[PDB]
Symmetry: D2
Subunit: 330 residues, 4 copies
């Protein structure tokens, strides 16, 4: 794996489509400009084998109905089956089922480290893991965690780590998170400040999605607001598609006309079906290697780099050799 990954990435990059090349260029420029904002979903947490929603709804069906749901179990039941439980068994049973799985000490996946290596201004986050932020503090980066409405006005730094659907920091109660059918319906009325903060960071930062799927509820709720906003008033968000099967061109056209920009991980690498870790790692490593310039081969690229990092100083009669080391990131 020593020379395997470097050569594999080199081969992948020099064959990429120009659209993906422009996407990588823009993402790297935003990252080095203190403007990138990440959007990690449920997918990134499952890379550490975190308890997924489907197992929880399966147990909720088993307890409430006496048996797990037969056949397919993706028919909007993800929001309904828990809700009935909350409206039948009450509060204590909901809390117990919640704490049974979500109280687990899990190690952090390296994908989180690669994400935080991009130096993002804010990280708008949806999952419930208490280990997404733990990967943030084990490095030298402080992120003010905002999970409820009371934490919006008490933020200290200008960098926010936003738990839009809440988290279990203030205990494992079933009221501090957005899980049942009612919370998803009343999200705009129970968390108005968090919604406004979300739309604020989205409008004034480059947005990169990760860990989501084309058709998730949150992506749709963001896209309808995007379509409602205006014409050419938002920077188009970047989407990291990581599904195993390659994306058909028609869906790509539809979603990139709906106000999205898709980076499909299954096309540029011909990996196996269930290889999610490498599928994320390919795109994340392309971004990281483009940050630190492990992709330059032609002399023109070298000189364009030097000129892009030195041109602003052409307006200065002279510059000390000592602080020139700060120009080229040490």
């Amino acid at each position: 794996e020593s020379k395997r990954y470097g050569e594999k990435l080199k081969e992948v990059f020099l064959m990429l489509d120009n659209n993906v090349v422009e996407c990588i260029k823009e993402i790297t420029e935003s990252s080095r400009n203190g403007k990138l904002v990440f959007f990690v979903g449920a997918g990134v947490s499952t890379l550490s084998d975190y308890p997924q929603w489907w197992r929880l709804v399966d147990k909720y069906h088993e307890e409430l109905y006496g048996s797990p749901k037969k056949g397919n179990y993706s028919s909007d039941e993800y929001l309904r089956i828990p809700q009935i439980f909350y409206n039948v068994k009450g509060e204590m049973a909901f809390d117990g089922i919640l704490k049974d799985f979500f109280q687990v000490d899990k190690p952090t996946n390296p994908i989180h480290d690669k994400i935080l290596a991009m130096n993002p201004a804010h990280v708008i986050t949806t999952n419930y893991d208490n280990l997404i932020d733990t990967a943030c503090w084990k490095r030298g980066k402080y992120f003010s965690v905002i999970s409820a409405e009371e934490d919006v006005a008490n933020a200290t730094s200008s960098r926010y780590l936003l738990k839009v659907h809440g988290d279990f920091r203030k205990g494992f109660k079933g009221e501090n998170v957005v899980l049942k059918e009612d919370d998803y319906l009343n999200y705009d009325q129970n968390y108005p400040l968090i919604s406004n903060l979300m739309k604020t960071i989205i409008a004034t930062h480059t947005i990169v999605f990760i860990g989501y799927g084309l058709g998730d509820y949150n992506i749709n709720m963001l896209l309808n607001w995007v379509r409602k906003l205006q014409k050419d008033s938002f920077h188009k968000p970047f989407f990291i598609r990581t599904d195993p099967s390659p994306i058909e061109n028609e869906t790509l056209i539809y979603y990139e006309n709906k106000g999205l920009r898709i980076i499909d991980a299954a096309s540029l690498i011909d990996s196996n079906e269930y290889d999610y870790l490498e599928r994320y790692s390919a795109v994340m490593d392309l971004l990281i290697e483009s940050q630190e310039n492990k992709f330059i081969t032609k002399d023109d690229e070298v000189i364009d780099y030097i000129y892009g990092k030195i041109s602003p100083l052409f307006a200065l009669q002279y510059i000390r050799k000592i602080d020139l080391k700060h120009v080229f990131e040490y």
Copy 2:
């Protein structure tokens, strides 16, 4: 027969629902909320067939396995967005030009003599049945039909019909017009909400997970409990419904009528339990 003997077997709850529905029919304050189930009982094509036709024409692969809940309103958007409207309206024309005969359930619905009929469908089965039986009804399918009405018997077509040509705009089957339904259909929505408020509504041919049922429950929850009636829901699934779902959809307003418990029908015989429940309603007079 069991139909005579079931009058002693019905739960007191079900007896109360039957009595209330009969009283509403007698008072002329009964409205039947019909759906895709009754139209499909007359061998009318269902929406998933049109979804498959669009998917095969668009993607080129058949059905792509199990469809998601939102997939039934996404593929037509992908088709309308790139392919255009010509092929959309053409496919709608070819798939939906057939004129299926009226099923007996449509005859029973008008035999009950309802005050109004709110239909979510996109076929003129009820129009044809009303014209056959002679009971005049007022068709309300678009915003231009709210102002001009002949009699106070509204065939409230909320989702539109193909009367003004086989075009996409007249009928609500996309995603954008599902979100913009309140904006695009304000008068018909207001009329629908008022009709449910004043009258007594019995839902027929719907599943507990339907979109319209869920949106109507959402609008109901915000209302005052003592100022609103509990709509009747008649479920025709072939499986016996459990108590937890009944409680969940009972505190949500709907009164569930379980045809599975009343009559021991088969799995692929919707007509049997539909006719049984309609006959139980009728025979109470």
Copy 3:
């Protein structure tokens, strides 16, 4: 009386056509009068200005030093509800609105026109007394619960509420927050008002050129399709003639205005004759 014969000739087609449409709607039983304060003041009824004067007296201790602002009419009572209390708030309502007054002839002639429904924003019982003395059983709809207990199809829709349940501040929308929390508090009443406006022909009587209720109703009409509604009639009773430019403004928003100052010459405050002239023109045809 003996002078309208020439007035028929002086009036242009813009008023003759309105009168003809009103008469056609009346003979078809599809006319609704949306009356309010303005024909209530003719019976010497306590206006809102006296109420806000009392509130300002008990709040700041001094009479009004000038003319009340437009928002103050809605803010001064609210101040009294937030500073003093609720019992203090409705004490003045109890001792001040609770008054026995007769019904002016205009109220009787409004029902003599035989409208299908009447919608009124007043808090009084003048319209109810006239209905009782005439004999037309109008189902009073004033609270949220009454919508579920409408005995007859003809509704006396009092949108803002009544004192029949008691002279309480919660039964009538008076405070500013109550106006702001109107759709949330009164969904069924709002739905019924919207459907009656949409499915019938509405005539405004006893309103100023611009008030809150007419403004929001015209906005709701604005958020409609360009030909989904019938343009309502407006009977301006202001002593001064209506200017033409604002007439075009208010007609482009979907209204047809019939003034009385241009129709007849009267004094500064003789509103009885101003209402009577237009009402006689309407009823005679």
Copy 4:
């Protein structure tokens, strides 16, 4: 004299003034400039513009006093009947006269606000920002939000005539007032998030403006402890009467009024604003007179964090007390 003037202050004023100074020193203070700071020196107001709209529209001068609704109805009526050309011409004729800045703007910018939010279509605050030498990204239309140049936001909520003296670029009629959230979503969201995450001080407003009422209604749906109650610098030439003060404090406005602070005349708006502004600025350099209770309290507030630290050298204690 001013030293004992600071003493003749209600405890509410005493604590509000120190809170504002703490926020200013913490880079958390966001000013809210409104109509009244602009019209202080020479800038024309909306009443004369409505008067000329009545003249060009209704023929005769306005009689009596126009109601609050007419302020937006008359220009809207003029636009609907006569058209956009005459409306734009009238705006161009009115709003071109350049007026000099006033010391109140200099005092406002001297408190180093994190952001300033204004509903003024003029560039008086903008020019004062440029002339003083403090940089601010001007955000007036939606497209500016995406193209923000810095982190400091000079937010023109109602728009401005920076792209041309046109009726679309500014919210003046009733249509754009009613359809504001349907025309300016991004700038409204930015305003709301700034108000939620920072400290807001309203200046120039007088409890009779649509923006103040809209914001107060917006506050009612923000739980209980999730929001901070914004300050209010009222400068009307009349006492608050102590009941509307109670109402607005319950609704979320800690009102500070200039009538109680100083005994100015009824045409002394300049002095009325200047008194409060100088009082706020002079409290940014020093704290109030101390006693045995507060001196120890101040020292403990400046020394308690050092308690967790085992030992601290003596030379840098000047940095603890800021030299």
